[PDB]
Structures are given as C-alpha cells and as structure tokens.
Amino acid sequence: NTPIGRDGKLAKPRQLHNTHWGLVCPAETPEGQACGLVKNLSLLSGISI
Amino acid sequence: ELAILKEERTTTPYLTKYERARILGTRALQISMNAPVLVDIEGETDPLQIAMKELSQRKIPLVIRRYLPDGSYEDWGCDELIVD
Amino acid sequence: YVDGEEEETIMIAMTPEDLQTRSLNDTAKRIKPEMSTSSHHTFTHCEIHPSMILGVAASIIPFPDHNQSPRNTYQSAMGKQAMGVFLTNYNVRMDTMANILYYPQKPLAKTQAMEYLKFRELPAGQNAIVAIACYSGYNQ
Amino acid sequence: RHGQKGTIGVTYRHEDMPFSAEGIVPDLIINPHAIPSRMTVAHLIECLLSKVGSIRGYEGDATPFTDLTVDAVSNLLRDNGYQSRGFEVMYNGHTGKKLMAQVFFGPTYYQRLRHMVDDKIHARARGPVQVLTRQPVEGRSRDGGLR
Amino acid sequence: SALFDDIFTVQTVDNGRYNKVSRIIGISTTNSAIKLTLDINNEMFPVSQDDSLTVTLANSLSLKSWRPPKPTDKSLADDYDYVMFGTVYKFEEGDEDKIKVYVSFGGLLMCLEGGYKSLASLKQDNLYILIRR
Amino acid sequence: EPKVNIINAQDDEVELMLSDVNLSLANSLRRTMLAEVPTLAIDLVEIKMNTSVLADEFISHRLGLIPLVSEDVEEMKYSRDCTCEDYCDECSVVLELSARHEGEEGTTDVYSSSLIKVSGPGNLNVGEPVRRDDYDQGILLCKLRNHQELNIRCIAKKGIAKEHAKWSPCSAIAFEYDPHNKLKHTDFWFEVDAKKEWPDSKYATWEEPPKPGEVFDYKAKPNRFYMTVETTGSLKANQVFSRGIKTLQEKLANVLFELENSR
Amino acid sequence: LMDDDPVLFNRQPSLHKMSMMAHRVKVMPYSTFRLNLSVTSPYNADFDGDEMNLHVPQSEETRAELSQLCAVPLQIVSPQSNKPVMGIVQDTLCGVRKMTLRDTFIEYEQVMNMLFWVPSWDGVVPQPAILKPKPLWTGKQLLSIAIPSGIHLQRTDGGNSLLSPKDNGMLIVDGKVMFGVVDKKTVGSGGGGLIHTVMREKGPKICAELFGNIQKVVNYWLLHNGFSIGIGDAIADASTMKEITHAISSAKEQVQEIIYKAQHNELELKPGMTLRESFEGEVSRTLNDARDSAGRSAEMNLKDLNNVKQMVSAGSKGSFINIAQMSACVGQQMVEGKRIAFGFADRSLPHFTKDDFSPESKGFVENSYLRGLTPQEFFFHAMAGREGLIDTAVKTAETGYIQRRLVKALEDIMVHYDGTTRNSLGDIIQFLYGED
Amino acid sequence: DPTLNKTVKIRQGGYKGKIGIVKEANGDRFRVELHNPNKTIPIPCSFLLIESTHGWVPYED
Amino acid sequence: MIIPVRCFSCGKVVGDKWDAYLRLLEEGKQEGDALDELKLKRYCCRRMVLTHVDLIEKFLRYNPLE
Amino acid sequence: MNAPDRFELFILPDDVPKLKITPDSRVPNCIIIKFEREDHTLANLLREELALYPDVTFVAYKVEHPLFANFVMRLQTEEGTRPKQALERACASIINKLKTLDHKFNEEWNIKN
Amino acid sequence: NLMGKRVDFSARTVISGDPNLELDQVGVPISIAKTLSYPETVTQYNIHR
Amino acid sequence: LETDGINLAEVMAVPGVDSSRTYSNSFVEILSVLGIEATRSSLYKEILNVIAFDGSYVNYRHMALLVDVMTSRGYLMAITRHGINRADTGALMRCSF
RNA sequence: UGGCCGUUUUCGUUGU
Ligand SMILES: [Mg+2]
Ligand SMILES: [Zn+2]
Ligand SMILES: [Zn+2]
C-alpha cells in the first residue's frame, strides 16, 4: 500500500519505475482510484528484519 | 394587449414537433377519459391511435397559445396549422 | 541477497548462457539484445530465472511474454473473482459467502511456477473446447 | 486467462452447434473480432499447446523466457496428424452443409466469474421510502430505487 | 430479336486477386475498334487466352417473379453456354464514335466500345448477354 | 433408392456409409437421433437421509447422468400422459440405493452396480443400469468413510434428450462427405498450398482424388455420407438408428394427419 | 407491461443525448435485457458485463411524448456532427464485406431462404446474374433487395474508373447495388454513407427498418458461410522475416551512427531544441519509421485469404498497427513522450553497462509478439501499459467535470418563437440560432 | 381456510409427482411452491395430492 | 472433485474408467498410452482423465461430524 | 429465474393447433405456414424435398428466434397444384424413403453379424 | 434529492446481443413486466381486455 | 515568424510586419488590444483547433453558441463558479451549480 | 376483519 492518498491525482507516485526490477510485480494492480498504488512483491521478494 | 390580432400573426404556420406531441398526448388523454371523438374508429382502439388519425384529418378542437418572449401571446388553431 | 540500493552498482547476466559469449537466424523466435556498447564484459552476478520477476497472480498466465501488458494486468485483476476450491475444509468452515465449482480441473498449459502455487492441486477453472468463429451472430 | 472476458448471450442444444470431422462439438463459441484488436497472441498459443497436450496426453511447459516457439508446437501437432496451425474443418449443424471457412478449434483454460446475473436483476413498483424525505430507499436488497 | 451480335477474340485473360472470376479483354473480329472488356466466372464457364467467342445482346428471351426454368419452355439461350442477366448503369454518348455502354451483372461489370451504328440500340435498362460454346 | 453399407458394426459404435439421400435427410436423422430418441433416466431423487461430504443436489445430479437400460422404453407411456394418480409401475421404474461403510479404516466406493431395481413394468427390460461387463464395477457415484451412510429412493421417467442431456442415447456422431472436397464446399486455408499442409481424412481411400485435369461439375451434389455412430450403452446402435427413423416417420405422419384433418 | 408499449432506457454515464432513448417492449424469458447489436454505439456499450437502467411512463400524455420525441428512429443522425450515429458493426459489417465481394455466388435454395428473411420483402424473386447453365446470384443483388425503392448514391475511391478493376467505389441506382465492396465507408456511421441517404430520403421509419433487414440477411449468410480466425493469421513467410530483420538492422545501424556523430559534436542542432532533445527526437523518428517500414512489408506480404487482413479491410475491428505489432515488431516504447529513463545509475536496467543509448538499451522492443519479448523488453512494455492505464484513469474524471460545468452554464438557453436565442432573463445571445 | 402451509404433490400435469408447498391460496387456483426447482407455479385444486394422517389424500382434506 | 459422469463436450461416459486409469499409471505406463488402452481417442475426453484432480479423498480426510 | 420450461420445447398447449396455415395474398398460389414446436430438424427436411418437386415455385422457412419453438414456412406451388397437396406429397415421399432406408439397414445389420 | 432523486417504476439488469430483434425493441425479462405496471383508464374499447 | 512570448500591441508597430493580420494564441490579449469581436473570433478558432487536431469534427453552430454565450455581456465570462454565479440571473440557478 | 412496521454513519472492497 501507499499512504499518498488521492487528493491531487499526479502521476509520479502511481507510475512504475526501473528500480522495481525483480521486487514487485510489473503485471498486478487494481483498477480505478487505486490503480498503480497497491503493489505486490515479486516471487522472490524478501523483507529485511 | 398580450393577444395579437389574427391579421398580424407572425409566428410560423407549420406545427412544431413539440406542439404535435403535446396536442397528441392531450387529445389522447381526453379521448381516453370519455371525450368525444371527432373522426371514425374502425379498428384502432388505442386512444393515441385515434388522436393520430384525428390529427391527420385536421379535426382536433384545440388552440395553441404561443407566448412571445416579451409576454404577449397569439392564438393559432390546430385547424389552420399546416401539419407536415 | 541484494536490494535496490545495492543493485545500484552491479552488472548482471540475464541468464547463465550470457556468462559465456555466444557465436542460426531463425525466423520464428525471439532475438537477444545486441549488447555491443561494451566490447569487454566482466560479470559479477547472474539472474536465477527471469520469470521470477512476476507476481503470484501473474505467474498463472501462460506465455506472459506474448501479450500486451494491459491484458496481463486485466487477467491478474479478475483472477481473484474466479470460482473454484479455495480450501479443502469448506464443509466445516461456515462463512458468509463461499462458492465451489463442481469439477475443477488443472490447466492443460501450466507455467512451471504453478508447482509451488499449488494451482494444479487447487485449480479454479476448466479446460473447455471453444470454437473461435462467428456462428449465428449472437456471440458479438 | 488472457483478459478475453465475456458473458453468455444464448445457449444451443448439442445438435444445432457445429461439429468437426471427428464428431466433436465445441463447449463455447467466442467472437473472432475480439482477438486482433487486443493482440492476445498468448491466447492462440495456449489453445495450440492445449490441443497438443490433450492429443499427446501431457501438459505443456509455457514458462516465459524459454526456447519454446510456435514452430515446435506446429511440428508436433502435424506429426500427430493435424493441421500444423490448429485449424479444423467444421460443419454446420442446422444442415450439415460444410462451412466455407476453417474454424480454429481447441481446449482453452477458462474460469467462471463471480458476477452471476441474478445478483443484479432488480425491479421497483413501490416500497419503502426514506422517512426524512418521503423518497424511495437506496439499494437492491432493500427494494431501493435507482438514481 | 437480337439487338447485337459479333464474334470476339480473347486477347488477354487475367485472374489477379480473384479465383472464381477473371477479367478478359476481347476485340471483335468483324469490326476492329470494338473493344470488349468483361469479367467471367472461371468455374462456371472456363476460358483461356486466344479464344474466340460469339456474343449476343438481346433485350429479352421470349421467342415478373422468376421461376426455375421448365424444360418445356424454349428461349434464345438454348444454343449458348453462358448467360448473364444485367442492367445498364450508364449509356455513354462518348466521342465522335467512341460510344461506350455500361452493363452490370450484379457485380460483374462490362465495358464495351463500338461504333454508334453498332451500339445504337443498346440504350436500354436490362440486357442479357449470351456466349456460344 | 436409398442405400446402406455398414463398414464396422459393434454393440455401441456403428461405422457405416449412407449414400443416395438428400444431405438434408442425413443431417436431420443425425439431429433427431441425437435429440428425439425417447429413453429412461433418473428423474426424481428422494433422499431419505445422507451423511456424505457431497451435497444432496450433487448426488441427485450425478444420478441424473446414470444410463438406464431402456430397450423396452418404447412401451412405457409418458408420465405426463399416464392417467394414474401419482406415478404407477406402468409409467415409472423405481430404483433404490442404500449403501454404507463401517469401520474406522479404509474407504468404501459406492458404484453404479450397487443400484437396485425395486419395481418396473416387467418384464420389460427397463430400469437396469448398464455395464460394460459383469465384473466391471462401473460408474463411481461417491466415496464413504467411517459411519457415513447413503440412502436414496430414485425414480426414472420417459423424457427426451431435448428436455435434458441425460436422455441423450447418442454420445458422439461423426459425419462427413466428399473427403477430397470435389464439391469444393470448403475453401482451404494455407500458407504455401492446400495439399501439402492439410492431412487427409481416414476415408481418403473411399473416393478417388479428382484428376488434375478434372474440371468443376456445377450439377454435382453431396451423395455419400460416412456417419460413425456411438452410444453410451443405454441402447444398441442398431436400435438407435431404427428408433430414430421410426420417430421421424411418426412425426411426419402426425404432420400429415394435421394437414388432412385441418380441412 | 405488454408488448409494443413505450418505455425509457438509459446507461451511465449519459454523456450525450444519444445515451437515452424510448424503445418498445417485447416480453421474453430469461433475466437479461437485449439490444439490437447496432444500437450499442450510441450507448457506447458492450456485452462484456455492462448494465442498463429502465423507466416506464405512468400516464398517457407521457406515453405520447415518449413516442413522438424519443423513439430510436428519430435519433439516427446526430446533431453533434450532422451525421448518422448508429451503424453496422462487428459481425454484420465484417460479413457483408465478404458477401459483397465480386466472386461470391449463392445457389437457389439458400436464396429462397434469405429472400424470405427480409420482413419487408416484396415477395417477388429477382432474376439471377446467371440463367445458364446454373441459376446463380451474387451477394450484391441480395444486399440490394434490402435497400428500399427510390434510392440513389455514388462515390469515387482512389479515382477509380467506372470499370473499377480494384472493385472499390460505390454506385447504387434506384436502391440496387450496381457494384462495389460494401463496407464501413458505405454503411458505417460516417457521413455520406448509405444510412445517411436512406434517413434523409425515406424518413426515419424506413431507416430503422433498414438496419434490421441488413442485419438479418448478412447474419444469415454468414451463418451458412461462417468466419473464424487462427494463429496462422499472425505468421508470414520466412522471406518477409528476412526483409524485416534486415530493415531492423539498418535502422539500428542508422541510430548507431547518429549516436556516433552526436558524441562528437558534429550533429546539426535543430532550431528551438537543444543537443539532447534534438538527438532524441531524431532517434525516435528513425525508430518509428523503421517500425512502420517493417510493418508495411509484413502487411504487403499478407494474402487476401488471411483473416486478419479480411477484418482490417472490412474495418469492423483492428488497424494496421495491430498487424505490424503482432507480426513485424512491437517497436519503441514511449513514456511521457521520452524514451526509457536511466532510473538506475547511468542506465535503464542494471544488466547493461553504464551509458548505453542504443534502441534496446532505452526501450526498443525488437521482436514481435509472435516471437515473444525478451525480459527487459517485457518490463519496458509493462511500463508503457501502466502509463496508459494511469492516463485513462485520470482523464475520465476531468472530462466528466468539464462536461458538468458546461452543461450547467448553458442549461437555460432556449429558442423562442421570434427566432432569437435567449437565456431565462430575456438576454439575446443569437438573434437567429447559429446564424441560419 | 384451514388448507394452507401443507406439503402437496402433483398427480396430473407436466410436473406429475413433485413435492410442493402451498404458499398462497387466494381461491379456486392454488399457488403451490415446489422443491426441485426454485419457482412457484399456479395449479387447479383438483390436480394435487394432499398429505393426510395416512397416505396421500386428494383434494378432500 | 470427483471424476465426472459424462464428458461435457461429447457425452462419452468416462467416470467409470478413472480407477483403471490410475491402475495403468501405477506400473509406469506413459499417460498417452494409458489413455489409449482405455480407448479414448477424441481428445475431448482425453482432456478430463489427463487433467482431473481428485479432491474427494481430501474432503473425506476430515472426520465427519458423525 | 425466467427460463422457459424445457418440457415445453416439444409439448403443445391445447388451445394452439400443431400447425397453422396462412395464405399469402400478395402473390398467386402462395401460402405461409405457422408451425408449432418444430425447428430445423423438421423444417430443413421438408424444405429440401418440397424444393426438389417440379410443381413448386417458391418454398422457404425461417426460425424466428432459437428461444422460441416454432417456425414459419413459405410455400408457393404453381397453379397446377395447390400447396397443401404438394406438402403432403413430399411428406409421403420422405415417409417412404425413410421406410426403405430402415428396411435396408435392418437387412444389412442382420447379414453383417 | 432535488436535481436528482431515486425514482419509481424502474428496473436494472445486464444487456446481451440480439441480432433478431428490431431496432426500436428490447428484450424485457418476464419478471419485470410482471412487477412494473401502468395505470389504464376504463373505456368501452378495452373493457373486455 | 512564430514566437514564444506574447506581446500583441507592441509587435504590430514593428516595421516589416503586416499589422492587419498578426494573431496571438492568448485571446486575453485579443480582448485587451483588438477589442471584443476579434476576441470572439480568436476564441472560436482556438476551440476549433483544439477539438479538430486529433481529426474530429463538430457542427459549427454549437461552438458558435458556446463562444457567443461566453462573451454575451462583453467580457470573458470564464466558465466557473465565479463567472456563472456573478451573473445576475435567478438565485436558484447559480446556487445549484 | 379489514388495516399493516425494519437504522444510520462510517470505511472498505469491487463492478461498468
Ligand atoms: Mg467493458
Ligand atoms: Zn402411471
Ligand atoms: Zn468427450
């Protein structure tokens, strides 16, 4: 999730980025207002503890 | 005063679609609530159909009162209006 | 392990093959990038398998490298509204809304990754014989 | 599995539908128009590989970024005795007269969706009205009226 | 009852795109400058280059709903191997003597050139075209 | 005028050759025997009690598909028309199943064979479930485990494949003609040429390929239909064919009766 | 409710007044509404799950008004662009295209059927285009049977002659097709099409009937002929692949040399743009041009039997770029008008070395979908698709807002009898609406 | 009317022998709801079977 | 869940053959073979027995409420 | 929830006769038949033969909508024969053709095994 | 609730193709036609109906 | 000559330039310098260019009505809450928007 | 013996 809200559309937060290579799914995201916000970790992602 | 004499009437003599619809609905209602029919009925039991036919024969006793922008009005007869 | 920041300064080989320079000219297969801007290469890491970059709802799609990406995204979207068998013990669980397909069947065309997603063990769709043809004009 | 979403317009008994040379009939019929505009090549490749797997009796490997190409699938399908591109002559059902075109025909993985029709059907003649406004309530479940 | 007649040679045959239908450019034998361009169905009446043909253009066939042809009735066509009913969509009053007549057989068009004396009587609505053998 | 030439006969599958009949007729025969062959199948499933992990509707459905020997169904009247109050043994064949498992280990497997005929308008050979063999257990209806009991009181009736696909006696009708496309009714897609891509039909040797110089026949028609029938076993393929022909005949006869009676 | 009664009908959003109409009732089973496949465009609807709403008059005057004012026939031509709004779409269109090809022939019994399907048919068969040796009809005759009496038209495409060897161009006389491949350009919603003329000439009622008649006929013929698509439609001969591959190599070489020059401060500076911007614009033009060239090569390769080409020509779906991308090359992937940024340190993806400007290195998808993309190119394609999605999502709401504001602004302006256009107060904005 | 909310079958008609429940009994045309389908059908009073103390009793209960 | 009764496409009853298919698989015969010996030629049937998933054993693995 | 009865696709209501004829007054010796509970299975067969006859000018039918079980047949025989006779003649012809086919198949199956 | 409001005598549903219907006609499930209704004054022309 | 930057009054007096045709893309300066009617025409031209750039087309009368309402009072009645509400029409009207 | 009463407000998820 992203705590950027929706008051003011903009496009930098929603769009994809190069660094995402191999960490989030380039294919999955919902449709409508959340499109681009809600992401999903890639199939080999790992979170530092 | 607000009326204008039939000698000097200036509005178009064709019957506009809105006038057609309003007269048809009004007559069909009246027809459908025990009003007399000014033309023959043979098979068209539908009051709207009766109204359509009666208009086609120019046998409808209704006067349009068109309001000019100022507030004056003029009186056209459904009889005289040229139905296309 | 490596993160985005650490990735910032590492050169990777797309596959183990690239680790050795290659030497043909098929008319019906993909072509590798030219990669000619650095006549000398000194690799330091090699990807496990490129297909790993996808997500869970995305690995269900067969041949995702053969589609217009928005279609991939759409398919990912409805993948979560597909009737099927969510959990073996549906009988004992007693929830508000739950649906079960009588005769689920695994997809004839699997992606290798679906082994670990158990999809072939819990499918949510059938293999149906469909004819792509204007038959009587009701399918427009 | 490729976004070619759609509904069911009408259903046909077994006889009226077209059948191939072997007596098969298809489960479902979709619109060709939908494919070219959307460029869902994976859909066609999946249908081909599914046909190959069914005849050869095993599941196909469709992992992206591999050496598989439509060439190999065509070769296998031909060797197994079918058109190397998956076309199959079909016959009309209302008469049996052949179909001047050659239909594409095979098993594809579908999956039903949650939006059954009856969940959305609705009507309203008269019913509950908001006390505050003397206006009909909102929502299908409560006999609501549309805006 | 025939409004015209001549014998035509087949100069060139072209198929191009189509398969069941092909275009032929023919020139008359009796009178040059009568150039014929017609489109015919290969399967329904095959031909080839360098052929010769007998062409007729008769207003009617008697010697409105159609019916399958009874074998009892007789018609002018009985002695020809390809018939096409048509209509004239343009009757050109062309140059000094380059008069052109345009007939469409429901998609198959026919452009004809010839002397006004030759085409004077083809100013009509619907025309049959008959080809011998 | 009509001819017949059976190529391979059997209990279930018939692979024949029908020629010298209007293609309309062959197609209509195929349709009618796919759709309009009266048969017998489970209709009303009355469940006294159940303890399986399968929904009651799920079993009632599974029973709906069980093929019933209907070799004498032609004698059985329509339950819609029969005058008896409720059902009778002359308009309904009652079958009951009551199976159970006991013990804490293993899994029982209730098969179609466990079905039993209680009554039926005997000795009409109707009601019995079909089997490939005697020892062939057959169709699998469910699996039972410790303490799980299944009891049902089935009913069958005489309906037609129109009203549902359980009344279909036909499984898969092959059908074709002109294996070399002499009549050309199909245009062949290709990338290089029609002949070096499309593999030949199995009836390839049954009609000689057109000669290279052969030219089109505009009076040609479809003449030889090769239709290979198959059945689930609920009725013998020959019975299927004869019954379809009889049904179509009586239907046309009804139509002609209507025509004459109208005046 | 009984059949033939009048009731409203609607979709949301109701952008333009062609999103509401007054239809007639037909009672039927099942629990869905059904629309003639033509009227989808005015509702901008499709059956991928869309929904509609309904309303019913409760009085006769209202029934009269609905009948006389909001019936579908009167809505056929759009006062927005003075042209027909509905049109023959999808199967009917893509079919009637083939039915009217010159070399399609129909035997007698099929014609017996089709001529009876046309409800308004006169009941008098037309004589065939062949009376010997075999009575045959051409589709054009039948399609014409649909068109009512007293109809005229004409059109010249590509400057063809009145002979039309290309078989383009359209000439109708008394409502009988004289020749021409009937398709969108003739029956589409566009201006000057058959529908426009039928409307203007015979009134609305006949124009409505025309859609149903043509639909029935072409649907029936397609049924008894049928149409489909298959994977082979997306493949071409190896020679065309060699051509396109060498074209791609040439384009890549051109970009290589362009970079070599721009490196050396020898590349001319475009006025109004800097070195980098002009450099990018030039390379983008080069790559787009190479893609278009390869696409045109693959297109000219296609045979007329190929279904994709049949649809494209018919035009009921698809376009040239679709073919170019499926078969020839996806091409270049563009983001906010610029190539793929160097999100990493001096490169797009960590796999390439630093400072690579070559097409693939900044988002040139070399292969076509049929060949399948390589990983990096797949990722770039994903970026592009996400961008398009975001753009649509943003644009829809803003357009809705602007439309709302406008509608509120002008909501009161109406046309009085005097011929002057006044708002509520009586201000006069135009003395004669639109000046005519 | 004491003849409501009782299990009822159909002895004659296109649904011969289907268990149904009397949902509405306005008059002379009983509205009965079945079990196998998800629907309710009208039916004349004399075309039904009414459960009684013993056996199935026609319209005399 | 359980092997269906009738093939959806054609109608050729298959459910009874499931056990035999498992049996043939046991001794290591390749799947295409096993499907052959059952006399399943039309792949409209081959699709099922090749790609049906048995769940009823899983659903029974839970002790019934009885 | 509004699906038709699947037993109604073939069963006929009492008040509606199985077949209904309508003379086609706009041309001579033409009739239009309003069938009931029938589809391509019967219509195609009747039409093929009635077309094969010599004294039939026009014959055709159409399936209004697959959601309804009835179709309409147009028939127009020459003045020589009234259409009713032509239709019943075709009926008899198919009846006898089917009988012949049945007999031949019976004999063939007897000999085959 | 003034510019717009929830209204009566309405109905909503899915839509589907129908090549065999007129242009100005629309499939209307039976249940809705049974639900909605339209007042009809009593005249001599419809008393029986 | 095309330029970036708008100065309408000053440039027309620059020698070497046709001062009877020069046009600017900011119709506000059109109102400021070349009066109102020129403003109307420039506004219409700009709207037409914007809509038609893609390839679309709209009946002229509609855009004419839009512009001629926009400048009926003589000054740019920019379509927002301000301009619409600043109109002296009935309160019920301007309130709802 | 007619006559006859089922929340709001949030937030979420989705759908076109
Ligand atoms: Mg949609
Ligand atoms: Zn009985
Ligand atoms: Zn099967």
UniProtKB/TrEMBL annotation, chain D:
Localisation per UniProt entry: Nucleus
Taxonomy, superkingdom: Eukaryota
UniProt similarity note: Belongs to the RNA polymerase beta chain family.
Subunit structure: Component of the RNA polymerase II (Pol II) complex consisting of 12 subunits.
Function: DNA-dependent RNA polymerase catalyzes the transcription of DNA into RNA using the four ribonucleoside triphosphates as substrates.
Protein's recorded name: DNA-directed RNA polymerase subunit beta
Residues of the full protein shown: 983 to 1129 of 1227
Automatic annotation (TrEMBL), chain H:
Parent-record interval covered: 749 to 809 of 908
UniProt domain KOW: residue ranges: 1-28
Record's subcellular location: Nucleus
Domain of life: Eukaryota
Family classification: Belongs to the SPT5 family.
Known function: The SPT4-SPT5 complex mediates both activation and inhibition of transcription elongation, and plays a role in pre-mRNA processing. This complex seems to be important for the stability of the RNA polymerase II elongation machinery on the chromatin template but not for the inherent ability of this machinery to translocate down the gene.
Protein name (Swiss-Prot/TrEMBL): Transcription elongation factor SPT5
From TrEMBL, chain J:
Lineage: superkingdom: Eukaryota
InterPro entries the record matches: RBP11 (IPR037685), RBP11-like (IPR036603), RBP11-like_dimer (IPR009025), RNA_pol_Rpb11_13-16kDa_CS (IPR008193), Rpo11-like (IPR022905)
Major localization listed first in the record, in broad terms: nucleus
Record-given protein name: RNA polymerase II subunit B12.5
Keywords assigned by UniProt, alphabetized: DNA-directed RNA polymerase, Nucleus, Transcription
DNA-directed RNA polymerase RBP11-like dimerisation domain residues: 30-102
HAMAP family per record: RNApol_arch_Rpo11
Any one GO cellular component localisation term in the record: RNA polymerase II, core complex
GO MF: DNA binding; DNA-directed RNA polymerase activity; protein dimerization activity; RNA-directed RNA polymerase activity
Source organism per UniProt: Komagataella phaffii (strain GS115 / ATCC 20864)
Pfam families xrefs: RNA_pol_L_2
Family: Belongs to the archaeal Rpo11/eukaryotic RPB11/RPC19 RNA polymerase subunit family.
Presence of keyword Transferase: no
Entry's Gene Ontology BP terms: termination of RNA polymerase II transcription; transcription elongation by RNA polymerase II; transcription initiation at RNA polymerase II promoter
Compartment annotation: Nucleus
From TrEMBL, chain L:
Top-level taxonomic group: Eukaryota
Protein's name in the database: DNA-directed RNA polymerase subunit
Function (record text): DNA-dependent RNA polymerase catalyzes the transcription of DNA into RNA using the four ribonucleoside triphosphates as substrates.
Similarity comment text for this entry: Belongs to the RNA polymerase beta' chain family.
Included stretch of the parent chain: 1309 to 1405 of 1743
Subcellular location(s) of the protein: Nucleus
Protein species of origin: Komagataella phaffii (strain GS115 / ATCC 20864)
